[PDB]
Write a protein that binds this ligand. Structure first.
Ligand SMILES: [Zn+2]
Ligand SMILES: [Zn+2]
Ligand SMILES: [Zn+2]
Lengths: 513, 89
């Protein structure tokens, strides 16, 4: 109530001075009135206690913020401490929200709460501060400071954008989807370690375009559109190429059905769905193994390879097992199972000869490591009432003589019962993520090298190291996580011409290109 | 039989080998050394002088594209800025 009272006091004072006194009469009067009232109340009335600035902002009082902004705008150094206290409250709320101590937090809920806080502060800004530049700059700096505290922030946002892109069940229409995507990219604008935001988003691209189809269709093009902008076309071309090559995949798969009606030598091609991707966009999962193939899939792969070598010469294909799925038609009804190009080999070995074992699926299969264990437990361990794979020596640990059996378990009347236990989420593990992020850092450092050297030899060379400032400015958001890789790189590179910088003679360099 | 496969959905990866018979920068071969390894020096020993593979899927001697990346930097057989997607044949 003090602010309304001092506003009424200022109003009655200026009215008395303009009506009862002379014509100008106001400059020193209002100056001294401000210097006495506001310059004294500014320090203590907004921070002490009992509904000051922090409390009146926490409960969400719009009129209070508006009147405080319209009052403190007349006195200098008012907006300064105003934004200072606002940023202090923002830091407190962030440290209360970005708290890492404690496991069991939902990443999507965390990103949703962060976005809600951002939208609330933006609404308060637009409603009270009249879109002031200082408040925007301070909140931008605060979001830049408090967000890069955790390294899982880009990973948490990638999971959120994947949950929002996999299906538009919430917000069927396009307007709210557009708004939430704009808010998401705005939140990403003040984020760091965006190199793995892109690597984890490419991991999600692979998860949403290899384990399923028709994810969002037009909304994936909405994604490429909102991506082209953001930080500029430098990491967006990557996504462009990925989507162009998935289009290549679908077109080449139709081409395959078409001319398999041409390379048909067997009948293992009842229903085939082959996808053609490029290794320049999709990384190798673990090792690209070379396990065996069931006979009808053998004939299908042979037909596909013959077609791809006859009508698509100039490139050879490689076989793998760590990707895809299948529909195993079992048979009282005919319930069709599902094997992620994973349970196909084990179930085929069970067909060829039942009573198999670990010393049977690990010896005569050329099967990979613990990924095999996760693919195998999908049918036996942690199974509800759909356990189609049972065993005689039932034990948590896997010995070597555990014989296997198949249980009818007539419960799923649907003829499309699937066993999904693997790849529950997409959090991965600390080591592999770290090493691949270091690989992205080394790639960005090679980028630095190329850029700086080429530009300088045509566009202003340096004396010792002065344009290095420009090349790091070009890759600003993509510079942090790499340590001294850049230094070791430019060092190993000093060898031929078109680059000097030699610590012994770092003077004026050549001016070619 | 008891279990019969109806559908399959393998994903097949690929890698094209551009006219593997010469190099468009120095005009010698896809391998078998380069101009900076036949005329420049003779030893040609301990020379990882290998083939470089771009994202545009063109191929040259590592050396010949490295010497071309000095002045120019945009792959002479199209316009693409050109990456580095492989080393060796
Ligand atoms: Zn060459
Ligand atoms: Zn050479
Ligand atoms: Zn090219």
């Amino acid at each position: 109530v003090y602010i309304k009272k001092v506003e009424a006091r200022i109003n009655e004072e200026i009215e008395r001075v303009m009506h009862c006194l002379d014509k100008s009469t106001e400059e020193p009067i209002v100056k001294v009135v401000e210097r006495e009232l506001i310059s004294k109340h500014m320090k203590t009335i907004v921070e002490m206690e009992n509904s000051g600035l922090v409390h009146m902002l926490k409960n969400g009082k719009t009129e209070d913020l508006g009147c405080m902004y319209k009052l403190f705008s007349r006195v200098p150094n008012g907006l300064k401490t105003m934004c200072e206290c606002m940023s202090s409250y923002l830091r407190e709320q962030g440290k209360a929200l970005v708290s890492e101590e404690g496991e069991g937090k939902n990443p999507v809920d965390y990103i949703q709460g962060l976005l809600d806080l951002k939208s609330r502060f933006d609404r308060f800004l637009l409603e009270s501060f009249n879109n002031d530049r200082l408040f925007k700059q301070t909140i931008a700096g605060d979001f830049e400071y408090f967000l890069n505290l955790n390294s899982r922030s880009p990973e948490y946002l990638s999971l959120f954008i994947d949950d929002k892109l996999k299906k538009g069940v919430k917000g069927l229409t396009e307007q709210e989807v557009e708004t939430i995507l704009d808010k998401a990219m705005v939140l990403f604008r003040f984020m760091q370690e965006k190199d793995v935001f892109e690597r984890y988003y490419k991991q999600h691209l692979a998860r949403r375009l290899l384990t399923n189809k028709s994810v969002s269709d037009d909304s994936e093009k909405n994604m490429i559109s909102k991506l082209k902008t953001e930080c500029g076309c430098q990491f967006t071309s990557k996504l462009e190429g990925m989507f162009r090559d998935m289009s290549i995949s679908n077109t080449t798969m139709d081409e395959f059905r078409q001319h398999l009606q041409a390379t048909g030598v067997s009948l293992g091609g009842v229903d085939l769905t082959v996808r053609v991707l490029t290794t320049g966009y999709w990384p190798t999962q673990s090792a690209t193994p070379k396990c065996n193939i069931p006979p009808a899939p053998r004939h299908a792969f042979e037909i596909f390879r013959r077609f791809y070598l006859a009508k698509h010469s100039g490139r050879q294909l490689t076989l793998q097992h760590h990707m895809g799925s299948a529909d195993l038609n079992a048979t009282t009804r005919k319930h069709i199972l599902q094997v992620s190009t994973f349970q196909m080999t084990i179930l085929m070995l069970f067909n060829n000869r039942e009573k198999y074992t670990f010393e049977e699926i690990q010896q005569e299969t050329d099967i990979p490591e613990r990924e095999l264990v996760r693919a195998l437990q999908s049918l036996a361990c942690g199974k509800p009432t759909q356990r189609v794979l049972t065993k005689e020596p039932k034990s948590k640990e896997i010995e070597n003589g555990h014989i296997f059996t198949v249980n009818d378990q007539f419960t799923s009347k649907l003829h499309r019962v699937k066993i999904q236990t693997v790849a529950a989420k997409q959090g991965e593990s600390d080591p592999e993520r770290k090493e691949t992020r270091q690989k992205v850092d080394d790639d960005r450092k090679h980028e630095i090298e190329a850029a700086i050297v080429r530009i300088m030899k045509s566009r202003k060379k340096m004396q010792h190291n002065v344009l290095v400032a420009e090349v790091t400015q070009q890759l600003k958001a993509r510079f942090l996580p790499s340590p001294v890789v850049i230094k070791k790189r430019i060092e190993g590179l000093i060898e031929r011409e078109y680059l000097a910088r030699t610590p012994e003679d770092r003077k004026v360099y050549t001016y070619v290109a | 039989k008891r279990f019969e496969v109806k559908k399959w959905n393998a994903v097949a990866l690929w890698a094209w080998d551009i006219v593997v018979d010469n190099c468009a920068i120095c005009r010698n071969h896809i391998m078998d050394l380069c101009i900076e390894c036949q005329a420049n020096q003779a030893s040609a020993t301990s020379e990882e002088c290998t083939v470089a593979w771009g994202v545009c899927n063109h191929a040259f001697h590592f050396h010949c594209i490295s010497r071309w990346l000095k002045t120019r930097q945009v792959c002479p057989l199209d316009n693409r800025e050109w990456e580095f997607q492989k080393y060796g044949h």
